[PDB]
Design a binder for this molecule. Structure first.
Ligand SMILES: N#Cc1c(Oc2ccc(F)c(NC(=O)Nc3cccc(C(F)(F)F)c3)c2)ccc2nc(NC(=O)C3CC3)sc12
Ligand SMILES: N#Cc1c(Oc2ccc(F)c(NC(=O)Nc3cccc(C(F)(F)F)c3)c2)ccc2nc(NC(=O)C3CC3)sc12
Lengths: 255, 258
């Protein structure tokens, strides 16, 4: 059991509202992050969406995943995780424009791949891997979570198109990671020279548009570009699963 | 939930420490991990039981200041997997390589150690064996309380030494061990450094003739901290404060220095 008895959680300052509920910095045995629905009465579809997020988070125990600590039913539906420190990768790369050395860019890539490999082993498709959902905790450990405060740049073509009810795959996560690798090695978002959204969508969908890999920094290894392209392949089952990605990196890493 | 790990997944690598209880290795399971194994083939009822008790405890913990339990494995050999800490144990820092942390940092380490203990006690878990070695200073920044043993006398409270009941262990018994760690932090030494005989230490602490020497604390150790130590080291269980109160005391203390 991971219920947290009513009365123990202190909710602090508001951080933002996602699709689910609202995230606050709180205090429960130290600094913790609390995501809660701000409603009097939750509908059975929300009651369920909560149970699934909790069902998923309780299955995780890994240094590179947001540490889930517990939930609360009364007074509000609420999920407590660890309170991260620093800022997201999205922030680092495109807002404050941190200038990481390549050795760290690679190490970040590795830790991200590490968490993703773990989730996939546990049969969890993330469905929204992107730099903003990646926190650089204490500026050195990667923590994958859901931090949304929609996100098409990380979507694979088959996802874009949406032929199926469900198009999500281990492979769809891999593509997203391939875009995250783009962000790392370019320091930039993709398709920066196109100002129209629907076109970006159409084209990526139709395989007319793909990330401009020449834009990567020059000290970026040739194995790492090669890996980048493999995760970005427009055809699903040509993309490698994470065990192979993790190996590819570890190889070049020790050289 | 089911935290069993499938067979042939874990790669036990270099050995890290032996001991007649079991063995700990650096390993590979979704990155770097620590792997405590039992190093016989056929485990006894007493070994199997004690294994289920350690898992039983660990899986009830989820907190930054607690060593992250990741999974267990029965086939082929019994094994427990935790996160791999990069860094050194706090004992190792203070007594082996003698790291000199600045005072604000020492207090932080105490704040976290207390933070995680508060957690455990609020989850009705008594460590029984808190000490500098069982505290890892992960990545030189976060504290991780674990149990790296395979008694440890300097941290036992008088009533624990006198073997009053079968269970002299208490939240307070743990608080006394914490007080000894604070002493390690603020002096950088183990207590009773001028005594070389173990029976005498036991006998004396048991009888109340020997208290840790608080004159030895660093000159810049605050008065409030020094008080808190003596409060934690009280010879009588009941006069020892519990961790909510401790943490609170530390946190008031903390804001009055950069
Ligand atoms: N926002 C936020 C946030 C955050 O988001 C949450 C909070 C609670 C949740 F349940 C969740 N929930 C999840 O992550 N759920 C989830 C769902 C599906 C899959 C996964 C998983 F594990 F696969 F990633 C997680 C997220 C957690 C920590 C945190 N720290 C921050 N620090 C700062 O803002 C500044 C440095 C001072 S912000 C922040
Ligand atoms: N030794 C070791 C070790 C370690 O000990 C373990 C391993 C597995 C366990 F199950 C356990 N078991 C427990 O922690 N059990 C336990 C039992 C009761 C209560 C508690 C708790 F969580 F309350 F503290 C834990 C311990 C874990 C990580 C680790 N990392 C190290 N890194 C280095 O030394 C490198 C130089 C940088 S060493 C190391």
């Amino acid at each position: 059991d991971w219920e947290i008895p009513d009365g123990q959680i202190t909710v602090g300052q508001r951080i933002g509202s996602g699709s689910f509920g609202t995230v606050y910095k709180g205090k429960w045995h130290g600094d913790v992050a609390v995501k809660m629905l701000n409603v009097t009465a939750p509908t059975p579809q929300q009651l369920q969406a909560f149970k699934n997020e909790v069902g998923v988070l309780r299955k995780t125990r890994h240094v590179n995943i947001l540490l889930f600590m517990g939930y609360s039913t009364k007074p509000q539906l609420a999920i407590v995780t660890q309170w991260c420190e620093g800022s997201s990768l999205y922030h680092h790369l495109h807002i404050i424009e941190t200038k990481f050395e390549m050795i760290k860019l690679i190490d970040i890539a590795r830790q991200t791949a590490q968490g993703m490999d773990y989730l996939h082993a546990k049969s969890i498709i993330h469905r929204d891997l992107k730099s903003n959902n990646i926190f650089l905790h204490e500026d050195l450990t990667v923590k994958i979570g859901d931090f949304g405060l929609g996100s098409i740049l990380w979507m694979a073509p088959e996802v874009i198109r949406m032929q199926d009810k469900n198009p999500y795959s281990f492979q769809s996560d891999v593509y997203a990671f391939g875009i995250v690798l783009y962000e790392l090695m370019t320091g930039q978002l993709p398709y920066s020279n196109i100002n129209n959204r629907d076109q970006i969508i159409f084209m990526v969908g139709r395989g007319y548009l793909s990330p401009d890999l020449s834009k990567v920094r020059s000290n970026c290894p040739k194995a790492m570009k090669r890996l980048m392209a493999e995760c970005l392949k427009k055809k699903r089952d040509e993309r490698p699963l994470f065990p192979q990605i993790l190996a590819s990196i570890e190889l070049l890493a020790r050289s």
